[PDB]
Amino acid sequence: KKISQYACQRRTTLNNYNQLFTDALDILAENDELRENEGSCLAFMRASSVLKSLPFPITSMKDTEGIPCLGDKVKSIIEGIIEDGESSEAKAVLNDERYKSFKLFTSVFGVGLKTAEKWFRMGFRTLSKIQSDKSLRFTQMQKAGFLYYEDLVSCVNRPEAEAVSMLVKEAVVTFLPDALVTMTGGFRRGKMTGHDVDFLITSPEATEDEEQQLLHKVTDFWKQQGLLLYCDILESTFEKFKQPSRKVDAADHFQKCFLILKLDHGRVHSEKEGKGWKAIRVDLVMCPYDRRAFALLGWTGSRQFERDLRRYATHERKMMLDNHALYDRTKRVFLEAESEEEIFAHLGLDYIEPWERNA
Numbered sequence: 115k116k117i118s119q120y121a122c123q124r125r126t127t128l129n130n131y132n133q134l135f136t137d138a139l140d141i142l143a144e145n146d147e148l149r150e151n152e153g154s155c156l157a158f159m160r161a162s163s164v165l166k167s168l169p170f171p172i173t174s175m176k177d178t179e180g181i182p183c184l185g186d187k188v189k190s191i192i193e194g195i196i197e198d199g200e201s202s203e204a205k206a207v208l209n210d211e212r213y214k215s216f217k218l219f220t221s222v223f224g225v226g227l228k229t230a231e232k233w234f235r236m237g238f239r240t241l242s243k244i245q246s247d248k249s250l251r252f253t254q255m256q257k258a259g260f261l262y263y264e265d266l267v268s269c270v271n272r273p274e275a276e277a278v279s280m281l282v283k284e285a286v287v288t289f290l291p292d293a294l295v296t297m298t299g300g301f302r303r304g305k306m307t308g309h310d311v312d313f314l315i316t317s318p319e320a321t322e323d324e325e326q327q328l329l330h331k332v333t334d335f336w337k338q339q340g341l342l343l344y345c346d347i348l349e350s351t352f353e354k355f356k357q358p359s360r361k362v363d364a365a366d367h368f369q370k371c372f373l374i375l376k377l378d379h380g381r382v383h384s385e386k387e388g389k390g391w392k393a394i395r396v397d398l399v400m401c402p403y404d405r406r407a408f409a410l411l412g413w414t415g416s417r418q419f420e421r422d423l424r425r426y427a428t429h430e431r432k433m434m435l436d437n438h439a440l441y442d443r444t445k446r447v448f449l450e451a452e453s454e455e456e457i458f459a460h461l462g463l464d465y466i467e468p469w470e471r472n473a
């Protein structure tokens with residue numbers, strides 16, 4: 115059969131046989147994001163995504179025949195890597211002063227594209243020179259980002275993610291004992307590591323007020339217990355009867371919080387001390403019970419899988435999909451789902467397992 119142009123019609127597992135090509139294409143896509151070239155960024159992301167789905171490594175240009183999303187620019191990059199095992203294009207990006215600075219500065223929690231650009235234009239090149247500067251003013255997010263930098267830059271492993279899951283579940287059930295807590299993001303897709311641990315929380319019997327107060331109760335409990343190192347709660351802007359997003363990259367309107375938690379080493383059951391704890395980035399999302407499948411699907415990712423799911427729904431099925439709902443423009447009805455499988459069925463897609471969504 116023919117490989118689909120949509121990530122939602124491909125099985126993308128963590129055994130990537132084309133890391134030589136995709137690491138180069140991911141660097142080129144990231145540079146186009148920095149250079150504000152959204153179009154070229156998207157073309158490299160789609161090419162990298164399709165190669166990640168292959169069950170074999172590309173070893174000749176003939177191997178690329180019949181593969182979609184491989185334009186002439188991309189094929190030149192693949193050709194170059196086949197030639198000497200390296201990408202001269204990606205090598206130039208890795209040695210570029212702006213690219214190096216952007217990667218380094220945005221590696222700090224609280225620093226995005228605008229602050230990284232600002233510091234570069236000010237002549238900063240190292241985090242040591244930024245942190246020690248007496249004229250710079252930092253946001254509370256950046257202060258936390260610098261204070262817990264070494265812990266946050268070290269990858270969160272599965273024993274740590276599970277230790278955090280235990281803490282989240284223990285805190286949540288204290289206030290809502292019927293609540294369902296699910297680990298989402300990369301770890302749900304089978305990843306060994308991640309930069310953070312994400313969770314979806316839902317309750318079948320909670321009221322609108324109970325739903326709203328849970329993240330405040332849980333974070334106050336952790337603040338009392340001296341485990342809350344950073345906390346930012348974004349209130350819900352969810353609209354029960356609004357049509358799903360038409361945007362390329364849909365925004366999530368559910369109540370959520372961006373945290374840094376103190377994880378004591380005694381809570382981690384691993385193969386393996388220092389201060390005896392590690393700072394961990396944790397995100398919590400609270401959603402209404404009836405929207406739990408849409409939120410789970412959205413938060414499981416990957417970002418490319420989500421983009422293609424929504425693009426397929428729009429272009430192929432005249433349906434509108436987002437983290438909150440699924441709307442059928444032809445039948446003029448919202449479609450209900452109690453599981454991810456039901457969402458895939460509504461869209462006419464064969465079910466793709468979470469570990470097959472690493473697009």
Ligand SMILES: O=C(/C=C/c1cc(C(=O)c2cccc(F)c2)c[nH]1)/C=C(/O)C(=O)O
Nearest residue numbers: 298299300308310311312415416417418473
């Ligand atoms: O990999 C991509 C990100 C989506 C995504 C969401 C997350 C987390 O936030 C996350 C991380 C670790 C643990 C955890 F529980 C949650 C992980 N995957 C996107 C590509 O497709 C690309 O950029 O090419």
Ligand code: NA
Nearest residue numbers: 220222224225
């Ligand atoms: Na950052």
